[PDB]
Amino acid sequence: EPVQFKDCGSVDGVIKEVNVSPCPTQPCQLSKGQSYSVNVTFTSNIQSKSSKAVVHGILMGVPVPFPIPEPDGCKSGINCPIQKDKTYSYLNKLPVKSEYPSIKLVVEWQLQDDKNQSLFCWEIPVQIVSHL
Amino acid sequence: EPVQFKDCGSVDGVIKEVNVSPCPTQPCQLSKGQSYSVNVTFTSNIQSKSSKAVVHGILMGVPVPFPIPEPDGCKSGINCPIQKDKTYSYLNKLPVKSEYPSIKLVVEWQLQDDKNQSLFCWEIPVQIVSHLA
Amino acid sequence: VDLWSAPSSQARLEKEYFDQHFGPFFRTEQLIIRAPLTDKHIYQPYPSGADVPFGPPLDIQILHQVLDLQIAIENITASYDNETVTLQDICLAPLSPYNTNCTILSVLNYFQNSHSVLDHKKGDDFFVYADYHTHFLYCVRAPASLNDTSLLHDPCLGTFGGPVFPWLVLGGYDDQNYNNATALVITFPVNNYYNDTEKLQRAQAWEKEFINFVKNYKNPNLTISFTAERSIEDEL
Amino acid sequence: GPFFRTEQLIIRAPLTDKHIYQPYPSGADVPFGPPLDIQILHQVLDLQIAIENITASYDNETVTLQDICLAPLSPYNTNCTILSVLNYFQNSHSVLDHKKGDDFFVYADYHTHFLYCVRAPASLNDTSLLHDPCLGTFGGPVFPWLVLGGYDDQNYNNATALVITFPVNNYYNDTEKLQRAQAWEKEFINFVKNYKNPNLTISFTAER
Ligand SMILES: CC(C)CCC[C@@H](C)[C@H]1CC[C@H]2[C@@H]3CC=C4C[C@@H](OS(=O)(=O)O)CC[C@]4(C)[C@H]3CC[C@]12C
Ligand SMILES: CC(C)CCC[C@@H](C)[C@H]1CC[C@H]2[C@@H]3CC=C4C[C@@H](OS(=O)(=O)O)CC[C@]4(C)[C@H]3CC[C@]12C
Ligand SMILES: *[C@@H]1O[C@H](CO)[C@@H](O)[C@H](O)[C@H]1NC(C)=O
Ligand SMILES: *[C@@H]1O[C@H](CO)[C@@H](O)[C@H](O)[C@H]1NC(C)=O
Ligand SMILES: *[C@@H]1O[C@H](CO)[C@@H](O)[C@H](O)[C@H]1NC(C)=O
Ligand SMILES: *[C@@H]1O[C@H](CO)[C@@H](O)[C@H](O)[C@H]1NC(C)=O
């Protein structure tokens, strides 16, 4: 479902939609040990040869770096090289582990380009919950 | 009547009562062409030879000096010299004139001593009215 | 270009979408409230200025109680087909899912239907420089404004992303002096559902509980008239 | 003991459910009873203010609650003593709706302020982002066991009823003040008896 998001500064692109599945109610509830999919549709304002995805988990106003399995956006549903005015759908899917804490936080997702500038930057409220 | 007041820093004394008359409702509504009396009972914590009354009208946070006919406090109900731990009553009466602007302001009243420090410092809300409310 | 203009352009786009999608037809659930035990009062600006008269229903306590009734009505839940029917399931909310707030045409929406915004004041230790009087007087002249030009900086738009025009939520005033209003008009628009009789039945099932709830609501400080779209199909 | 007439209200919320406060970013859930819902508290606050605005007539003069109530700090603090959970928020819609957080989660709101104030009701400042006082408007503390009912042990957050008490001065050497308070009590009884809100079940007692 399309979720509400705040744009944290997409300079070289315009976000069209942030779709998180499954997320019936917002802020998105993430059950532990369970995979969720993100699909970001955006329109690029420039031409770039690569794209590098960067994820942070913001707690108490401080971003905590979160490494993903694959940070390259060319292997994430984007046909590189990125062309101007074209529309793309970054795709990814991550599992919520049982090591993660049951906390509320703000997930921040960026996709940098050749000049290391944001093709998109968005943040959504997320709460990792326990299924027990 | 005893009105509510804010203390703007009475160093050398303790205010016991600020009495404005007539003021049935607060902020005190001052009708043009009238007269109002003030009576400030306070307890001096210091000895002093003299006392000078200083009055300001605070408008939008800016104090504007207001000359009063008798600034010498020793001629306003206070028996100078002022003795420590003694209670006094400063008395005065001023007319609200017709050429004063009808406006809401804060009246700041202080009584300085030998060291030019306030035996009392208080401020009350006042509204000069062309019509009452 | 100018990255500071993003919230302004975005809010402008939301306003454009709302007025593009408001439509001429909807089910109307309406209240007309008056204040019998409250008299008119006068607002005096600081530090001076011409006094502004304000009608009985625009007393701050009356507005708080009316806002209570409004939130309560927005919380009315009905039962139908072994399933709950809230106002949000049937209300005209064009900006969903980005903005799920139900459209409520009311003077309280000048204050975003919030008690706190309604009680928002600024001043020194003795006098108020700006309160709900100044905000009301501003918003009825610039309903689509994103901020008033006062110490409050409060918005005028009403929770659903669109402006509330004063002639739609006030009655009994003289000329265009909206501050002299003697009656409040609160309107809840509900979707028509032309080709979906199911959600229409849900809407009517909510309307009956609206009529029942308002019928069982008595406040000595308020006189409340109310109409529902259901009253027409109930008889002739 | 005596020398104090009690105008009392017991308020419950039959159409309102319990809810759970979840602290940011994590922590133990804290349950909150039906009448401790924010909208219920706003409605109760406006009923209390309405009662404060009730006016009677005695001896060709108008009689308000301020003319018969217990105001221990008169004549500089003329606020009537009102024993109510709303006095933890100074009977203010503003203080009741006061909240702080980022743009996504609430760090502190009326939940945390309530949790703090029931443990230190005389505090002039909670130790949270709100910096709000716990003290009542009349200048004294409001003890939780006098304004809440139905809770378990000392978990005041699980309260299912609110108690709002207006104490007015009682007299045995002044029949005039007693009859004045009795006329005001008549107006109060009429008002509360003609107040119907489906979200609130209200029990009223005057000094008949
Ligand atoms: C679109 C959405 C469904 C993507 C979901 C991605 C989640 C599962 C990831 C992204 C960002 C991740 C957080 C980043 C940052 C932290 C801080 C870390 O704290 S620490 O104590 O281990 O240093 C705990 C894991 C946690 C909460 C991560 C949980 C897992 C986390 C929420
Ligand atoms: C009993 C007591 C508490 C009230 C009586 C004293 C009043 C009447 C005096 C004290 C302080 C006075 C003001 C001081 C300061 C001003 C500003 C002045 O503005 S100006 O720009 O014209 O200088 C106008 C007169 C005005 C408002 C005075 C009115 C008259 C004023 C309110
Ligand atoms: C991602 O979203 C876009 C836009 O809604 C859609 O066209 C695309 O099919 C989606 N991708 C997947 C894998 O579902
Ligand atoms: C790229 O830019 C981001 C800011 O968006 C910054 O945090 C990061 O350090 C930069 N990385 C490099 C390699 O310059
Ligand atoms: C001034 O006020 C004090 C306060 O009690 C009182 O004792 C005194 O008599 C008053 N004086 C005059 C002249 O009114
Ligand atoms: C005395 O002190 C006051 C402030 O307390 C100050 O404004 C003034 O300039 C000083 N000197 C005088 C009054 O001569």
Q: Which of A1, A4, A11 sits opposite C98 (nearest CB)?
A: A4
For residue B81, give Cα distances in angstroms to B1, B48, B69, B74, B119.
28, 6, 21, 8, 13
Give the number of the atom of ligand 5 that is nearest the alpha carbon of residue B19: 2
Which atom of ligand 3 is closest in space to residue A16's alpha carbon? 4
| Cα B98 to middle of ligand 5, angstroms | 29
Alpha helices in chain C (DSSP H): 6-20, 60-74, 87-90, 115-118, 132-139, 197-215, 230-234
C109 phi-psi bin (left φ>0, alpha ψ -120 to 50, beta other)? alpha
Per the structure block, which two tokens stand in for B80? 């100078």
Mutational test site, ligand 6, from B10, B54, B72, B110, max ligand atoms within 8 Å of CB: B54
DSSP-assigned states of every residue in C156-223: -S-SSSS---GGGTEES-BTTBGGG--EEEEEEEE---SS-HHHHHHHHHHHHHHHHHHHT-B-TT-E
C55 Cα: distance to centroid of ligand 4 (angstroms): 59
> What is the C-alpha separation between C112 and C100, in angstroms, rounded?
14
Q: In this complex, how many residue pairs, one in chain B and one in chain D, have their CB atoms less than 8 Å apart?
A: 3
Report whether the peptide linkage leading into residue C47 is cis, meaning its omega lies within 30 degrees of zero: yes
- CA C113 – CA C160 distance, rounded (Å): 11
Classify A8 as helix, strand or coil.
Answer: coil
Closest atom of ligand 2 to B23 CA is 1
Chains that touch C (3 or more CB pairs under 8 A): A, B, D
Structural domain tally of chain C? 1
Q: Considering CB atoms only, which of D39, D96, D195 is closest to C219?
A: D195
**What chains are in contact with A, requiring at least 3 Cβ pairs below 8 Å?**
C, D
Q: Which residue(s) pair with B28 in the sheet?
A: B126
The first and second tokens of residue A111, run together, are: 């996709």
Q: What are phi and psi of A66, to 5 degrees?
A: -125, 110
A46: CA distance to ligand 4 center in Å? 18
D-facing residues of A in 57-76 (CB < 8 A) are 59-61
Whether residue C97 lies within 8 A of chain A, CB to CB, comes out as: yes
CATH number (domain holding residue B16): 2.60.40.770
Nearest to B41 by CA among B69, B13, B66: B13
Do A27 and A126 form a contact (C-beta atoms < 8 A)? Answer: yes
Distance CA B73, CA B69 (A): 11
**CB atoms D93 and C216 under 8 Å:** no
Map tokens 């209240």 to a residue. C31
- Number of the ligand closest to the Cα of A40: 3
Can you give the residue range of the structural domain that contains B100?
1-133
Q: What is the pairing mode between strands D161-169 and D148-149?
A: antiparallel
Question: What's the alpha-carbon Rg for chain B, to the nearest Å?
Answer: 15
- Which of B104, D9, D133 is CA-nearest to residue C126? B104
From the CA of B4, how many Å to the nearest CA of chain D? 6
Does residue C5 fall inside a structural domain? no
Whether C68 contacts D40, CB under 8 Å: no
Which residues surround ligand 3 with Cβ inside 6 Å?
A 17, 19, 39, 41, 89, 91
Count the domains in chain A.
Answer: 1
Q: Pick from A6, A101, A125: which is nearest to D26 by CB?
A: A101
- Phi, psi angle pair for C135, to nearest 5°: -65, -45
d(CA D139, CA C181): 38
Yes or no, beta carbons of D39 and C114 under 8 Å apart? no
**Which experimental technique did the depositors report for determining this structure?**
X-ray
Nearest Cα residue to C224 out of C32, C72, C29, C35: C32
Q: Is C98 helix (H, G, I), strand (E, B) or coil?
A: coil
Residue type at position B128: I
Whose tokens are 């786009």? That residue is C13
Calculate the alpha carbon distances from D159 to A2, D23, D34, D145, D155 in Å: 39, 19, 8, 10, 8
Any contact of C with B, at least 3 CB pairs below 8 A? yes
The answer to whether residue C169 is domain-embedded is yes
Pairing of strands A28-31, A62-66: unpaired
Write the residue in D22, D25, D103 that is nearest to A59 by C-beta: D25
| d(CA B81, ligand 5 centre) in Å | 20
Instruction: Answer yes or no: is C212 within a domain.
Output: yes
Per the CB < 8 A criterion, the answer to whether D165 and D82 are in contact is yes
Gap from CA of A35 to ligand 4 centroid (Å)? 28
Q: Tokens in use for C41?
A: 């009062």
**In a mutational test of the pocket of ligand 4, which residue from A56, A116, A123 has the highest number of ligand atoms less than 8 Å from its CB?**
A116
The CA angle C6-A4-C143, to the nearest 5 degrees, is 55
The C-alpha torsion from A19 through A22 and A27 to A29, rounded to 10°, is -150
Task: Look up the domain containing D151 and give its range.
Answer: 1-208
The Cβ of residue D190 has, within 10 Å, a number of other Cβ atoms equal to 13
Residue D61 neighbours by CB under 8 Å, 6+ apart: none
In a domain, C18, yes or no: no
The whole-angstrom separation of Cα D152 and Cα C55 is: 47
Please answer whether residues A6 and A106 qualify as being in contact, where contact means their C-beta atoms are separated by less than 8 angstroms: no
Going by C-alpha positions, the residue among D115, D159, D128, D134 that lies closest to residue D16 is D159
Phi, psi of C53 (to 5 degrees): -80, 145
SS (H, E, C) chain D: CCCEEEEEEEEECCCCCCEEECCCCCCCCEEECHHHCHHHHHHHHHHHHHHHCCEEEECCEEEEHHHCECCCCCCCCCCCCCECHHHHHCCCHHHHHCCEECCCCEEECHHHHHHHHCCCCCCCCCCCCCCCCCCCCCCCCCCHHHCEECCECCEHHHCCEEEEEEEEECCCCCHHHHHHHHHHHHHHHHHHHCCEECCEEEEEECCC
Nearest residue to D40 via CA among D170, D162, D148 = D162
Give, for ligand 2, the residue of B3, B66, B105 to mutate: max count of ligand atoms closer than 8 Å to Cβ.
B66
Q: Does C235 reside within a domain?
A: no
